[PDB]
Amino acid sequence: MLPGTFFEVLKNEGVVAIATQGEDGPHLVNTWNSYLKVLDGNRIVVPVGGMHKTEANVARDERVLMTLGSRKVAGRNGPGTGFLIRGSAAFRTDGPEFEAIARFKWARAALVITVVSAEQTL
Amino acid sequence: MLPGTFFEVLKNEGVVAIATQGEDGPHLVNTWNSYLKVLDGNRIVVPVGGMHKTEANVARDERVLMTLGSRKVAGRNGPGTGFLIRGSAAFRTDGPEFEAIARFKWARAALVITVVSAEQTL
Ligand SMILES: Cc1cc2nc3c(=O)[nH]c(=O)nc-3n(C[C@H](O)[C@H](O)[C@H](O)COP(=O)(O)O)c2cc1C
Ligand SMILES: Cc1cc2nc3c(=O)[nH]c(=O)nc-3n(C[C@H](O)[C@H](O)[C@H](O)COP(=O)(O)O)c2cc1C
Structure with missing residues (x-):
């Protein structure tokens, strides 16, 4: 479901934000556009x-x-x-989703996001 | 309390992410580094x-x-x-905080963030 324009964004560098729910309120962390790996089956992998x-x-x-x-x-x-x-x-620490980002030697894990929706908001 | 390195980041374009707590989980929206105004008092103003x-x-x-x-x-x-x-x-709709972003013709409000902590995470 990821559209072509999303792939054009990933050709350019930038700051990615990832929000999760904590017991206390949201949490927000980052990675770089150039670190994302998109796999078949609507999966985006982040080096952790x-x-x-x-x-x-x-x-x-x-x-x-x-x-x-x-x-x-x-x-x-x-x-x-x-x-x-x-x-x-x-989070995965082995398997092909981990190996997709294992070239980053500092990575202890892969964060695998399976996409359920994508909205171009501008 | 905003440090010099933060102002150096703001001379470069990028995507800003702002997380809030919703009813059913976090919400996440964006602006651009080049749109932020910083005022005295640890205040960041975003055009809405x-x-x-x-x-x-x-x-x-x-x-x-x-x-x-x-x-x-x-x-x-x-x-x-x-x-x-x-x-x-x-959210402000009159006053000096609104005036700082009034050059954006599509703005309906200023989102004013009063900073309590700033961490350089890389
Ligand atoms: C621009 C940017 C890119 C980052 N990239 C990564 C990354 O690829 N992987 C990572 O684990 N943390 C990265 N970080 C640090 C994370 O945002 C986060 O601060 C750190 O992993 C600690 O996460 P936690 O607060 O969930 O413990 C990055 C930070 C910045 C500002
Ligand atoms: C890179 C980027 C920059 C944006 N900048 C703004 C902005 O400056 N002000 C704004 O109101 N929305 C901006 N948006 C749209 C917001 O992220 C958001 O989708 C929209 O305001 C709707 O907000 P809501 O989901 O809280 O109703 C931007 C979107 C992107 C992708």
């Missing part, structure tokens, strides 16, 4: 170095939200666009 | 065109989280850095 509070949150509520964008891709009414992605998350 | 769900969430729980960064500013271990900002939010 820290994300310890995020991991604790996902263990109790697997729903996540993610945003990303780029001023270098056109939106509906001028330069710049981005996406709100909703999905479910899991 | 939509953010209707965000505004409903803030009316119930004023706490927000914000992230932003840039690959063009050095972090602690290599190129690229960014920040986790925690603060409290209010």
